[PDB]
Write a protein that binds this DNA or RNA. Structure first.
Ligand SMILES: [K+]
Ligand SMILES: [K+]
Length: 1338
RNA sequence: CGCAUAAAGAUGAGACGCGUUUUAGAGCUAGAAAUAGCAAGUUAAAAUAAGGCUAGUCCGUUAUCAACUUGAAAAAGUGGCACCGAGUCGGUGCUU
DNA sequence: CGTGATTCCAGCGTCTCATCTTTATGAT
DNA sequence: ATTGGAATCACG
């Protein structure tokens, strides 16, 4: 019945747990051992850590599922096209589609001729010579008027449908207009035709180059405006240019229409809004817009076509043919020049696929960029390659037709080519004439994002509802699918239930009931004071209703002056009015009401009580649907109430956002006695004038009981389902779940006695490609040429100094100069907010400067002079997204207030008190699971106090009192951090009960200027220290009030050092059955290997290739009989099989038949043992091996290095220096100098451990030789290399490390034969309960 | 108190472009062959987790998972204490 | 001629839309 | 980046 406490450190890859007593001692208990081994009881300390792999997200799974859906839908598209052509093709070529379907098979497996298109070699060769590429055939079919073979027509249509281009552009793109300059001149002429007072003159400006430039859209607009004399970016011409290029312009200011009238041409609603804009100004202006529309295409098409469109109606096919012709010409010229200049390289360029030459560019794995990088030095070191070099710099040398950059092709181009082909060939083939709409729909059909998968209740990701129970095709999609209901469900399935009534859905944020609720909430909280009042009083119901009718329904916002004058002075005739409890401007307002009043021009319609649900439906319809058609079809049922103009005005209006309260709570539930709702009480509460919080905090009112009863099961979820509801990374959710499970197990271990306290801390927790994307966007938006100066690699940009240099355009960010790319390691990286105020080391709070002294004073924000100097550059960086809003706000804080003492004190406080929501959720879960007993008067009995700590407290405790931590030594540091968390939390809640509200989960009212808080929180951990800065403290600390020994410096520190020096710590790696992909996604070429996995049942890997490297879900220990020799005699073998992910379901269906098929016979089902990954085996001398897979092992022992060695390593390695004053820093340096021999000792330790467990003889000899080689190196470098050295003895998968210049590879244990005779250990989640099975006895 | 913005992240849906694999695009000449020289090279079909049944324009890489017993499953149950110590836990006394 | 040491290799870019939470800035 | 699969390679 001894009282104890639990300490926990939560991480994404570890959960450390510890049990402490009143003395802060870690108990040790004898735990029973199950199994067939002679061992029956083992002594174990109640401290350890659970290790597991990081919890993966579902992004990869979602992407692969979407890819599967896309592939299935593309195959169906092809099937639809074939079924359209089925009869006519069968009349023309019976087995053409069969040959297409079996084109993948080898000649042996084909049931028809090997030539798919024509079925004979002569016609196939003739076709391939006449049409070298599919685009030649497409252009021929588009342009030629002669009757063509149906097979070629189908091939062109299938090539268009299968690869149909993106749908990011809505509307119709006419390929006829391509010239940028011509359409720009047309737009200028139209503008001058309508505007004579200030005509636009753009003659002498290279429109093509500027408008089709490779810079950003914003920078293109800025360049054009700069080259336009007397024109503004926000002007009418500037807005037209922005619309044409793609940036959405606001057209209100240009015409003073008082309506935004935003027009984005890519958006489909543009036309409607365009018409709206016309109704505001006139009809002729659209002509200019019309020209602008054309200009838009003139940009986009010019990016992809770059070909004449007057000769042919298929500009894409013409562009691909031009690419093919240029490729042929350049290839011939390059071959001739190479033969005449550098013959010895010719093979390497044109025959060896291994290199990145033309042979590797066509036949090998080399890409266009790799081929260009390989061939540029050759072109430079040659004559007559000027045109080739020009094309290469333009990325237009030997280009393929199917390349990575074809993603910019809109679907309109392919649709136009398809329409042209169908028009050409409809006369000869009647079915093409009849089914032209069908093929166009097949090409153009796209499932709306709000419809989702077309399932029939067998999918967990589907929400669509079907009007009729019939199979869905692209031609009857609009008739079968209930688009409105599906669109509503798309929003409603992902939205939030209100926290009070989980069954009900929340109202839209712009719902009229929501706004009335907020306004009445604010009005009830109004404490008016005027002359003739003995006491301040709240407003009554009638007065509040009159104010709402007069003030809020006639004004968008209500201020105190309007309340005093228009209501108190006009009606109440009181000229003296002082308000209390509210600010000048009321937060709540009737915005939706005013918008509806403007739209419908009627007050009685809005104010009618009986029809307000119609308006609540209106706002819901406007919130739910984004496409205007859905809103139109939903509001067509309301056509009679409004007019056609009113409907057109309502259609454009769109609302966004959802509230936090449901309709049933606000106005559905009623008090039993009164018969009034929450809104009714808000309207007329009486003299009380209770607000919403007091409404849901009133015991007498039935609302509290109704709210409690609605969540009769609370969340109504299991532990796992409750944790899944938390917002955060999946890895941290996995850590939380493991934490809860280990807490339950620890409670079970201690005799079902709940701990007095549970202290918990939680940690704060490719990139290069993100950096490349960010720098590209920023430089393109800014318009700089810094990137072109030096091509920086993805790994090279990882340097923080270089990253800041590139993000700041190479300039010093505080002054007006430019830094040098080669003068690195000289500039300083300084934080905008001092590290004392805010410990942030991210890019958003770091700035590279030539000298930090230019920042001014380092005790505050950068000075006002720096802000005045570089505000323009900071804003320019912000507009380029090189710096974020937070960074810019921190930079310009000096002009807006700088940093006050209160803010600094708050920043100091918020580094000790945990204010993260995820930690609060963990504390709530633990408190709910550890406090199940209720006090009689509706109170929780807090038998277990849940305390939340921050890592800063434990880190300071470690640093100040020589309890140093090195993560490379072993995984004991997790358990040690958990124990230190427990000790610190228990001591803090012992000495300072008043801080429970800050630390213990729950709400407490015990609270007891800026400098007082600053030094109170700064010295909240100073009662552990013997001396302060030079005041001293007593050896034994006292609680105060009630006398308790919270800390004893003469005893407790020794106990802590003994605990941290304990060799036995329960380090358990969570065994997991591996799940994921079946094998590597890379399809391998055909080879005579048994390790290849067929991609289909009928595709033999020796003839078609396939995947390899399967992922083993779990191994299976099976003893059985195998056939040996020609006689196939039965030999007894006990072996691991390693059931893979692909074979897991087959094995679990029936293991006996699976093992019989694998080759093993007489398998024993009972003796079959399932071993997931990281299964623990003990062999001899304490050597432990974890089962990485069926044929690989991992190190499973830990090096219990003495605490003195860890402290010496931490002191000598200078972790961010020693972070101490010169006195103690010199003392620690002397400690290192006089304890230099510890290094040798540490090496000895490692060596002996390596000889006892690791058994890496070659690596151990190599590392010993390396250590002897660099014995004369400085102590700091030797200590750092020795810290790196511990990777050899680390627990887990072997990894390669580096000792100075020498590198040591990983010694992998690729044999699992030893563990077949070892002792398998099943460890519970804490490792205290173990089951040891001696496998040699099987 | 709330409100605005930004950033980050989670989840879900709809698309695009590649990549990879096999086949098709009779390679020619001198050769007995080994080969040597020369010619050509851009494209397409199919698959893109094996596959499953619920047969859908669906689902298949997330989360969960020591052992034993009771079980569709969710899950439920199973493991004395104190003291001395310490090379991954041992010893002693009490108890069962 | 098995067997330990050594080497190599691993699907990847883009866009549109919606909902949510959390952190960090401020206005008021 | 990582760590298991696969092939290659040196060799006693
Ligand atoms: K998993
Ligand atoms: K386990």
């Amino acid at each position: 019945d001894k009282k104890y406490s639990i300490g926990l450190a939560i991480g994404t890859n570890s959960v450390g747990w510890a049990v402490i007593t009143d003395e802060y001692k870690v108990p040790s208990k004898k735990f029973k051992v199950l199994g067939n081994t002679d061992r029956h009881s083992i002594k174990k300390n109640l401290i350890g850590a659970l290790l597991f792999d990081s919890g993966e997200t579902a992004e990869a799974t979602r992407l692969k599922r979407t890819a599967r859906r896309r592939y299935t839908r593309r195959k169906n598209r092809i099937c639809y096209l074939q079924e359209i052509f089925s009869n006519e093709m069968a009349k023309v070529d019976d087995s053409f589609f069969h040959r297409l379907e079996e084109s993948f098979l080898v000649e042996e497996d084909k049931k028809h001729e090997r030539h798919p298109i024509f079925g004979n070699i002569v016609d196939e060769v003739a076709y391939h010579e006449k049409y070298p590429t599919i685009y030649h055939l497409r252009k021929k079919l588009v342009d030629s008027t002669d009757k063509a073979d149906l097979r070629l027509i189908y091939l062109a249509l299938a090539h268009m449908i299968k690869f149909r281009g993106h749908f990011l552009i809505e509307g119709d793109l006419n390929p006829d207009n391509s010239d940028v300059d011509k359409l720009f001149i047309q737009l200028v002429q139209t503008y001058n035709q309508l505007f004579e007072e200030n005509p636009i003159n753009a003659s002498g400006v290279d429109a093509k180059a500027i408008l089709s430039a490779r810079l950003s859209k914003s920078r293109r607009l800025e360049n054009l405006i700069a080259q336009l004399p007397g024109e503004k970016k926000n002007g009418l011409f500037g807005n037209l240019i922005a619309l044409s290029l793609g940036l959405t312009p606001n057209f209100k200011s240009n015409f003073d229409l008082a309506e935004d009238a935003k027009l984005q041409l890519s958006k489909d609603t543009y036309d409607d809004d365009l018409d709206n804009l016309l109704a505001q100004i006139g009809d002729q202006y659209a002509d200019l817009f019309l020209a602008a529309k054309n200009l838009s295409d003139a940009i986009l098409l010019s990016d992809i076509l770059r070909v004449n469109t007057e000769i042919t109606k298929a500009p894409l096919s013409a562009s691909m043919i031009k690419r093919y012709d240029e490729h042929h010409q350049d290839l011939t010229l390059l071959k001739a020049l190479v033969r005449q200049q550098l013959p010895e390289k010719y093979k390497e360029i044109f025959f060896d696929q291994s290199k990145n030459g033309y042979a590797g560019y066509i036949d090998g794995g080399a890409s266009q960029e790799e081929f260009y990088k390989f061939i540029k030095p050759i072109l430079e070191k040659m004559d007559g390659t000027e045109e080739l070099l020009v094309k290469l710099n333009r990325e237009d040398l030997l280009r393929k037709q199917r390349t990575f950059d074809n993603g910019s092709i809109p679907h309109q181009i392919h649709l136009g080519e398809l329409h042209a082909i169908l028009r050409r060939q409809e006369d000869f083939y009647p079915f093409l004439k009849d089914n032209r709409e069908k093929i166009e729909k097949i090409l153009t059909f796209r499932i709306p994002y709000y419809v989702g998968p077309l399932a029939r209740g067998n999918s967990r990701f589907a929400w669509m509802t079907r009007k009729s129970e019939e199979t869905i095709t692209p031609w009857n999609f609009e008739e079968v699918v209930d688009k409105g209901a599906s669109a509503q469900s798309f929003i409603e399935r992902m939205t939030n239930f209100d926290k009070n009534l989980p069954n009900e859905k929340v109202l839209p944020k712009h719902s009229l009931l929501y706004e009335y609720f907020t306004v009445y909430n604010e009005l009830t909280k109004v404490k008016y004071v005027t002359e003739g009042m003995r006491k301040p009083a709240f407003l009554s119901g009638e007065q509040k209703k009159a104010i709402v009718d007069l003030l809020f329904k006639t004004n968008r916002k209500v201020t105190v002056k309007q309340l005093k004058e228009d209501y108190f002075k006009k009606i109440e005739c009181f000229d003296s009015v002082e308000i209390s409890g509210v600010e000048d401007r009321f937060n709540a307002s009737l915005g939706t009401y005013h918008d509806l009043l403007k739209i419908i021009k009627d007050k009685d319609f809005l104010d009618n009580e009986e029809n307000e649900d119609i308006l609540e439906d209106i706002v819901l319809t406007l919130t739910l649907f984004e496409d205007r058609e859905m809103i139109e079809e939903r509001l067509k049922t309301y056509a009679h109430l409004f007019d056609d103009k009113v409907m057109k005005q309502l259609k454009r209006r769109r609302y966004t956002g959802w509230g936090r309260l449901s309709r049933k709570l606000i106005n559905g539930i009623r008090d039993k006695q009164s018969g009034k709702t929450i809104l009714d009480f808000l309207k007329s509460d009486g003299f009380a004038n209770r607000n919403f919080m007091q409404l849901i905090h009133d015991d007498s009112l039935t609302f509290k009981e109704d709210i409690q009863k609605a969540q009769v099961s609370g969340q109504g979820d299991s532990l796992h389902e409750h944790i899944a509801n938390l917002a955060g990374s999946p890895a941290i959710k996995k850590g939380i779940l493991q934490t809860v499970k280990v807490v339950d197990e620890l409670v079970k271990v201690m005799g079902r006695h709940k701990p007095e306290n549970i202290v918990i801390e939680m940690a704060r927790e490719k990139n290069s490609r993100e950096r490349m994307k960010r720098i590209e966007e920023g430089i393109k938006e800014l318009g700089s040429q810094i990137l072109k100066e030096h091509p920086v690699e993805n790994t090279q940009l990882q340097n923080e100094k270089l990253y800041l240099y590139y993000l700041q355009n190479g300039r010093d960010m505080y002054v007006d100069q430019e830094l040098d790319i080669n003068r690195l390691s000289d500039y300083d990286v300084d934080a905008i907010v001092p590290q004392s105020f805010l410990k942030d080391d991210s890019i958003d709070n770091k700035v590279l400067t030539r000298s930090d002294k230019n920042r001014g004073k380092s005790d505050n924000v950068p000075s006002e002079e720096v802000v005045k100097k570089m505000k323009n550059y900071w804003r320019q960086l912000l507009n380029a997204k090189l710096i974020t809003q937070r960074k810019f706000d921190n930079l310009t804080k000096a002009e807006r207030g700088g940093l006050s003492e209160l803010d600094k004190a708050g920043f100091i406080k918020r580094q000790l008190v945990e204010t993260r929501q995820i930690t609060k959720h963990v504390a709530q879960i633990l408190d709910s699971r550890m406090n199940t007993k209720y006090d009689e008067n509706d109170k929780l009995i807090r038998e277990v106090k849940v305390i939340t700590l921050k890592s800063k407290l434990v880190s300071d405790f470690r640093k100040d009192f020589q309890f140093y931590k090195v993560r490379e030594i072993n995984n004991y540091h997790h358990a040690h951090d958990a124990y230190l968390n427990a000790v610190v939390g228990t001591a803090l809640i012992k000495k300072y009960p008043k801080l429970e509200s800050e630390f213990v989960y729950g709400d407490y009212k015990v609270y007891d200027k800026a400098t007082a808080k600053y030094f109170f929180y700064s010295n909240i951990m100073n009662f552990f220290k013997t001396e302060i800065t030079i005041r001293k403290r007593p050896l034994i600390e006292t609680n105060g009030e009630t006398g308790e020994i919270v800390w004893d410096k003469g005893r407790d520190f020794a106990t802590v050092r003994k605990v941290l020096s304990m060799p036995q710590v329960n380090i358990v790696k969570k065994t997991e059955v591996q799940t994921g992909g079946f094998s590597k996604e890379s399809i391998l070429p055909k080879r005579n290997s048994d390790k290849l996995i067929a991609r289909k049942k009928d595709w033999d890997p020796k003839k078609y290739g396939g995947f390899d490297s399967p992922t083993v879900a779990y191994s299976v220990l099976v003893v059985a009989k195998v056939e040996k020799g020609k006689s196939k005699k039965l030999k007894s073998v006990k072996e691991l099989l390693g059931i893979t992910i692909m074979e897991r379901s087959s094995f679990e269906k029936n293991p006996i038949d699976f093992l019989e098929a694998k080759g093993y016979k007489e398998v024993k089902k009972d003796l079959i043992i399932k071993l997931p990954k990281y299964s623990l085996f003990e062999l001899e001398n304490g050597r432990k091996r974890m089962l990485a897979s069926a044929g690989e092992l991992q190190k499973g022992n830990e090096l219990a290095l003495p605490s003195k060695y860890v402290n010496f390593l931490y002191l000598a390695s200078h972790y961010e220096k020693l972070k101490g004053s010169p006195e103690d820093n010199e003392q620690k340096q002397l400690f290192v100098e006089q304890h230099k021999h510890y290094l040798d000792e540490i090496i000895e330790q490692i060596s002996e451990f390596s000889k006892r467990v690791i058994l890496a003889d070659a690596n151990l000899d190599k590392v010993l030789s390396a250590y002897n080689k660099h014995r004369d190196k400085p102590i700091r470098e030797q200590a750092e290399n020795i810290i790196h050295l511990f990777t050899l003895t680390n627990l887990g998968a072997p990894a390669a490390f580096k000792y100075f210049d020498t590198t040591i590879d990983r010694k992998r244990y690729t044999s699992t034969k030893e563990v077949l005779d070892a002792t398998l250990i099943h460890q519970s989640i804490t490792g205290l309960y173990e089951t040891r099975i001696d496998l040699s006895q099987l």
